[PDB]
């Protein structure tokens, strides 16, 4: 990755769009901020329904402006009581949710 | 801390020697890693004898 991003620095590209799973999202972030293109100059745009579901907090301060696209809006009041629910359940009778939001994807589980 | 390298760059500062303790030295070097103050331009220099101590 450190070859890879100084590959886009033989054409100095400050426009990045990331299709990745939403760990191999956070992996080569980490590798962003190693490297420090999160500041000033840069943008990115996260291409996926989960982009309030990746780590905004590790790149929210550094510069860069990050982009993408949002599914499943927490600020509906229909969301805000599934996520009443959602925070309120075991985590060891259901594993993964006992937190805070939901991926996008176990959304639409329910959804479906 | 994101209030002081700004207050930094109220001076456009480059060049800032850290006299902290290890564990605070850590810790101000991760809020320069939160702002990307590690980038080329910026000089730092750690004023303790355990400069192979820290996280490099």
């Given at each position: 990755?450190?070859?890879?991003?100084?590959?886009l620095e033989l054409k100095k590209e400050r426009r990045v769009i990331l299709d990745c799973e939403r760990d191999?999202?956070?992996?080569?972030?980490?590798?962003?901020?190693?490297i420090g293109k999160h500041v000033k100059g840069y943008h990115y745009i996260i291409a996926?329904?989960?982009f309030t579901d990746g780590?905004?907090?590790?790149?929210q301060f550094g510069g860069a402006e990050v982009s993408g696209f949002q599914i499943v809006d927490?600020?509906?009041?229909?969301?805000?009581?599934?996520?009443?629910?959602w925070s309120t359940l075991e985590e060891k009778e259901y594993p993964?949710?006992?937190?805070a939001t939901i991926?996008?994807?176990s959304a639409l589980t329910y959804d479906a």
């Amino acid at each position: 990755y450190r070859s890879l991003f100084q590959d886009l620095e033989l054409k100095k590209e400050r426009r990045v769009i990331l299709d990745c799973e939403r760990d191999k999202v956070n992996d080569i972030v980490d590798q962003v901020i190693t490297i420090g293109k999160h500041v000033k100059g840069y943008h990115y745009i996260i291409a996926n329904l989960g982009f309030t579901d990746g780590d905004l907090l590790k790149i929210q301060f550094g510069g860069a402006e990050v982009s993408g696209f949002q599914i499943v809006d927490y600020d509906d009041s229909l969301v805000s009581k599934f996520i009443e629910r959602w925070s309120t359940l075991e985590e060891k009778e259901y594993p993964g949710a006992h937190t805070a939001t939901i991926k996008y994807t176990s959304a639409l589980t329910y959804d479906a």
